[PDB]
RNA sequence: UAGUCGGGUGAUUAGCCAGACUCUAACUUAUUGAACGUAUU
């Protein structure tokens, strides 16, 4: 569509790949550049065009936190505080959300992971339902990818829906534009405490 | 597996292709399916199932279509739950089925006289033959005692602790309730016994004899 | 009494109306819009005769709306909610979650109970009527979910009219510390000169929607954005500069001036000639010195063909 | 298991405790507080008391449930002896001296009691002035309290005799006693534990300057 | 260095740690817990960026909680700065307790929760003090509201109360403060920072009393 | 420093030039309906 055109040659991303989708040259080399393109700084450290990570993120009715806000450093984010001040929390909500970009790189309609009914709400809560909203940030083409996770707690009538559509729309991107020509692709990982195991040589996963 | 999950829970879940071993290692495409066509008299000429897995980071996702294998097991649930009918046996039988007996049997918590405990890892590969002796064993103890001897005795205990209850010993009105509970679930599982239809224990076990005897050359 | 209201204005008898009113909140055609982005917006549109009687609600009842709202307003805009804004240096930015669709006959009512202003007074009898005329049933098997759909004509004064009580209410208490405050829709602007008085709006908020409407209508918090000079600033699609006053923004002014160009060497096409000629007179309205200096750079007789 | 005497031995060398246990005794010793056992024999003699009546009064049918409520009061006899006979601190005050203990060295909970929600047990503690279960911990409460909990479980268990059983005699050795500590939590960690445990040898590893400035150096 | 031998007839990894070749059974639980960390963070990106000349310059959110888990005081010094220098592009997510971590990280990437917070704080904010470069005794006291002595400790209050005890009696050292001072001596010894202290608050003490005895003069 | 605002240039959604701003802190959105601007009558 002529929208869509104008859009995409202004440089929105999502617009080009909309186009590509439909017409399925142009719209796809201006998505695999605006994924590839990147240039080596004056440390001789290649540095991307369009940089993806984590804005802002809101906290609503979980686990302690009655409304809480944070916003996050592009680089490093330390998080500091006594125990019992949800710094865990935090990271855990985190993990959630990313669990929705891994889904679906690897999987068209893939399932991410879920707040807990159980554990998740907070205690006191009049509402009885928490929500953990997340914004990602992927190059001036893409400023805003919102996510929404959410549940009700256990047996109430009324169910929150989770909003998780942005997350899916930016993976297919990764996904299928690597499906056509190799791109590279971001790393989400989380390493609590749980990393301290004991280790086994001899035990191996035959799974994969 | 996909029938016998439907005809025993709606909404059950077959089984899966596996991604890692399913897939043909050069296949092109990135995905399996392996499709079935099932027959079911002139007015179900064609139940078409297809099961399929697509490999990790395809652009397209490939599922599975289970619905008319799921429809038909409905059909079976459905009117099986209203009236009692009969219901297809599925079984596999692997090299696995070569195995060494296990003697020491194990004591009938009574899951193996549920009708549905025919299902039970039927499609496993080595049968349940521990399964069978259990069975085997409790439907000769039923044969050899009366049925609802246990409700009569029951229902003379009843009985005898409400003549007591009677007689001014208030002190059993506790034990009086939990024995009547247990007279109503005697004739309840009695009922139902009667309400599924169920064929006689003796009968039961007759069937099973001539079938073994007769297969099986060497024994008598 | 509803009824003869509307018989009279669309010329029809009682009966013809009443006949048609008993399956009136399922005469809706559903269809989707697509979004600039990725994906469909669902609208639900009432059919034309649903409309014509809606429109004559509207025309015969006459519903209080406050200064504040700002859309669907007769002779104001977008232009006049961004100016409203345009001397401030700090802006607070709140949305309303699923605003139309959380709008249900019990709202509405509760709202004429509790209003100030000299609302209508509607029969026992016609309240009936007044639902199924003003609400739509999403779902067919279900007859007891009645919703305002953003598509019909009566929605807009509706949803105007159940923000009255909460619009009086907030914009006493932004008066007495020194905040401006305008509605458009389901868009709530905020601004001040004075640092730090924008934080203790949200939560302002949130207790006032919980005291008039429970929890029928809640804020987005994922859409509550802070800005000041420091930062891009925009009311309803017009960026405010740091002059204090109204802009398209350089990126759309730019665009403009590549179409322009474009025509001058006569590569526009008809479709993006009429965009063009479109987008302009929207510029006129929001920024005439904009033309002015188009005007300048590219010959006035060059635009003079263009929108001639 | 979890109430014999020397199930307190039951992995004490394997590293982790077994906080597990803990809440399996703690809340078995709860049960026990609102349900006492003498009442039951008291009952159990009654009822046994009643059905001999019964048997003597004609009733054939009900002495072979006289045999099993006989066999019954002799098992509850056994036991309160054998509780009797091991001279053991009675379950209440086994359950406060654990509660005070817990309370007084893990800074964050103030109490800790088990709930009937719906139809299963649940262990609850009041931490950092909110009540929450114990998988609603961090990581850092739930270690430290995990640690406490158990040896005050071991030490109740293997001193019956003395009127404070966490005066009882032991060796405990303990890896990095900061793990999951604040700086705050360090500065009393080790000041907690002696006082709680006073005649204990402990034997720790710690990177942790902030405890080192709670100890004199003869003991590094 | 990290090395696969198969000599002995199954697959082992060695490492030479510390100048001494070791197999990853028989690292302590720090080294190991650590190396597991950045091997296989290491290898995802390596996967993952197949078009990088360096693929460890590829992008992504990592979180790590408890960044100094197991970790001697001496390599918290290190673990941020390695980190970043190795993984550039990467956004980290870190907690941590440790002031000697925070002494290496600029306070606009730190995140406080306000000290009685209660569950009902809007906006986490940096802390007022710059921590990068920053002494650790001011992060413990400044960053994270910890007392440079332990307060459940006697002897941690004796120079504050013998300071209190010399401006109390015109800077003159009476018989209550000698014995404190004796007690001073006696337990953190003749070289302690401790005395050190009490000495420079004594001649300090005793110079401006003989100020103040010549301009009263 | 960075981000933001944007007067000018520039076959022009780029790049370049000039000037300025900084409450912890914009992410440009949606039709056929409604309103507003334009065109037509
Ligand atoms: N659902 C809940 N409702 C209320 N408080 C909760 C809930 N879940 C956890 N908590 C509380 O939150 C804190 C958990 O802290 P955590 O996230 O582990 O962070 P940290 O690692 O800083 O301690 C504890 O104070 C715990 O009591
Ligand atoms: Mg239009």
């Not at chain 1, 169910?159 to 989400?188: G, Q």
């Not at chain 2, 299902?119 to 590969?125: A, C, E, K």
């Not at chain 3, 008066?175 to 709006?201: G, H, M, Q, W």
């Not at chain 3, 309803?236 to 006053?245: A, F, L, V």
Request: proline content about 3%; aromatic content about 8%; hydrophobic content about 40%.
């Amino acid at each position: 569509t002529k929208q869509y055109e104008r859009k995409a040659k202004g440089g929105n991303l999502l617009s080009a790949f909309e186009l590509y989708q439909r017409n399925s040259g142009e719209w796809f080399e201006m998505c695999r550049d605006y994924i590839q393109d990147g240039h080596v700084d004056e440390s001789g450290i290649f540095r991307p065009d369009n940089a993806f990570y984590l804005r802002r993120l809101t906290l609503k009715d979980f686990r302690r936190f009655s409304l809480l806000e944070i916003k996050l450093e592009e680089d490093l984010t330390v998080i500091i505080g006594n125990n019992g001040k949800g710094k865990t929390s935090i990271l855990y909500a985190i993990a959630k959300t990313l669990s929705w970009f891994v889904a679906n790189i690897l999987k068209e309609g893939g399932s991410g992971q879920r707040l807990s009914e159980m554990t998740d709400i907070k205690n006191d809560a009049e509402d009885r339902y928490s929500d953990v909203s997340s914004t990602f940030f992927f190059g001036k083409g893409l400023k805003s990818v919102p996510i929404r996770l959410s549940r009700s707690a256990l047996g109430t009538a009324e169910r929150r829906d989770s909003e998780v559509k942005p997350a899916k729309d930016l993976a297919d991107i990764w996904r299928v534009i690597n499906e056509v020509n190799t791109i590279n692709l971001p790393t989400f990982a989380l390493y609590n405490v749980e990393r301290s195991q004991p280790f086994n040589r001899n035990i191996k996963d035959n799974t994969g | 597996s996909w029938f016998v999950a439907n005809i025993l829970k709606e909404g059950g879940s077959g089984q899966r292709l596996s991604e890692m071993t399913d897939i043909k290692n050069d296949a092109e495409d990135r995905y399996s399916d392996v499709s079935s066509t099932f027959f079911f008299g002139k007015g179900l000429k064609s139940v078409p199932i297809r099961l399929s897995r697509s490999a990790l980071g395809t652009a397209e996702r490939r599922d599975s279509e289970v619905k008319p294998a799921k429809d038909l097991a409905d059909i079976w649930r459905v009117i099986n739950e209203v009236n009692t009918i009969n219901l297809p046996t599925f079984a596999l039988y692997n090299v696995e089925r070569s195995q060494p007996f296990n003697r020491n049997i194990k004591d009938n918590t009574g899951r193996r006289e549920e009708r549905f405990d025919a299902y039970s890892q039927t499609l496993g590969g080595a049968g349940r033959f521990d399964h069978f002796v259990e069975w085997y064993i409790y439907l000769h103890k039923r044969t050899v005692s009366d049925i609802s001897s246990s409700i009569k005795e029951l229902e003379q205990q009843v009985n005898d602790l409400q003549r007591t209850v009677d007689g001014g010993m208030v002190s059993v009105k506790s034990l009086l309730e939990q024995m009547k509970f247990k007279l109503s679930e005697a004739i309840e599982r009695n009922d139902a016994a009667v309400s599924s239809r169920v064929l006689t224990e003796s009968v039961q076990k007759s069937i099973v004899e001539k079938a073994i005897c007769s297969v099986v050359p060497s024994i008598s | 009494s509803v009824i003869r209201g509307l018989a009279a204005v669309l010329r029809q008898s009682d009966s013809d109306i009443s006949a048609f009113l008993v399956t009136a909140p399922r005469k809706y055609k559903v269809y989707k819009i697509p979004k600039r982005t990725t994906g469909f917006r669902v609208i639900a549109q009432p059919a034309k005769g649903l409309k014509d009687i809606q429109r004559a609600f509207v025309q015969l009842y006459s519903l209080p709306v406050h200064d504040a709202s700002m859309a669907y307003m007769k002779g104001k805009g977008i232009r006049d909610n961004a100016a409203a804004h345009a001397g401030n240096q700090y802006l607070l930015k709140a949305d309303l979650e699923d605003f139309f669709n959380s709008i249900t006959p019990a709202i509405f009512w509760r709202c004429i109970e509790m209003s100030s202003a000299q609302t209508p007074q509607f029969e026992p009898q016609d309240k009936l009527f007044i639902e199924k005329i003003l609400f739509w049933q999403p779902i067919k098997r279900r007859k007891t979910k009645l919703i305002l759909s953003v598509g019909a004509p009566s929605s807009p004064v509706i949803s105007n009219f159940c923000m009255y009580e909460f619009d009086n209410r907030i914009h006493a208490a932004c008066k007495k510390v020194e905040i401006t405050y305008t509605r458009y829709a389901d868009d709530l602007t905020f601004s001040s000169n004075i640092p730090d008085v924008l934080k203790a709006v949200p939560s302002t908020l949130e207790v006032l929607l919980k005291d008039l409407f429970g929890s029928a209508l809640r804020l987005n918090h994922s859409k509550t954005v802070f800005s000041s000079k420091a930062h891009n600033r925009h009311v309803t699609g017009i960026t405010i500069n740091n002059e204090e006053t109204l802009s398209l923004g350089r990126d759309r002014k730019r665009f403009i001036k590549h179409l322009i160009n474009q025509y001058k060497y006569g590569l526009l096409d008809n479709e993006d000639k009429a965009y063009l000629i479109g987008l302009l007179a929207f510029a006129s309205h929001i920024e005439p010195s904009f033309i002015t200096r188009m005007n300048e750079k590219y010959s006035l007789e060059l635009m003079e063909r263009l929108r001639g | 298991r979890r109430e014999e005497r020397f199930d307190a031995y039951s992995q004490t060398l394997g590293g982790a405790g077994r906080f597990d246990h803990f809440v399996e005794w703690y809340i078995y010793l709860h049960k026990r507080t609102v349900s006492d056992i003498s009442s039951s024999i008291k009952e159990l003699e009654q009822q046994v008391n009643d059905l001999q009546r019964t048997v003597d009064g004609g009733m054939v049918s009900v002495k072979s449930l006289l045999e099993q409520m006989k066999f019954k009061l002799s098992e509850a006899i056994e036991r309160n002896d054998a509780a009797v006979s091991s001279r053991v601190l009675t379950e209440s005050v086994q359950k406060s001296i654990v509660e005070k203990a817990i309370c007084s060295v893990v800074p964050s909970i103030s109490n800790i009691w088990v709930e009937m929600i719906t139809g299963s047990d649940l262990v609850k503690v009041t931490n950092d002035g909110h009540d929450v279960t114990i998988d609603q911990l961090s990581d850092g409460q739930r270690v430290f309290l995990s640690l406490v909990a158990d040896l005050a479980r071991r030490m109740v268990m293997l001193n019956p005799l003395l009127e404070n059983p966490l005066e009882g005699r032991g060796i405990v050795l303990i890896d990095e006693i900061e793990l999951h500590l604040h700086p705050k939590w360090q500065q009393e960690v080790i000041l907690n534990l002696r006082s709680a445990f006073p005649n204990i040898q402990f034997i720790i590893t710690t990177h942790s300057p902030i405890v080192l400035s709670t100890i004199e150096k003869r003991c590094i | 260095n990290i090395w696969v031998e198969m000599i002995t007839g199954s697959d082992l990894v060695k490492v030479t740690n510390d100048g001494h070749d070791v197999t990853i059974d028989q690292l302590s639980d720090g080294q190991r817990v650590f190396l597991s960390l950045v091997a296989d963070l290491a290898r995802r990106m390596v996967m993952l960026n197949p078009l990088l000349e360096n693929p460890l310059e590829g992008r992504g959110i990592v979180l790590i909680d408890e960044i100094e888990l197991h970790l001697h005081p001496k390599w918290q010094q290190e673990v941020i700065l390695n980190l970043r220098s190795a993984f550039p592009n990467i956004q980290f997510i870190i907690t941590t307790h440790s002031p000697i971590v925070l002494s290496t990280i600029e306070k606009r990437c730190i995140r406080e929760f306000e000290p009685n917070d209660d569950g009902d704080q809007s906006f986490l904010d940096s802390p007022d003090m710059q921590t990068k470069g920053s002494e650790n005794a001011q992060i413990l006291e400044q960053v994270m509201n910890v007392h440079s002595t332990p307060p459940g400790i006697a002897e941690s209050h004796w120079l504050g109360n013998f300071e209190l005890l010399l401006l109390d009696n015109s800077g003159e050292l009476d018989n209550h403060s000698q014995v404190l001072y004796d007690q001073i001596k006696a337990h953190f010894g003749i070289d302690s920072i401790e005395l050190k202290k009490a000495d420079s608050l004594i001649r300090i003490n005793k110079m401006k009393n003989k100020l103040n005895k010549i301009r009263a003069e």
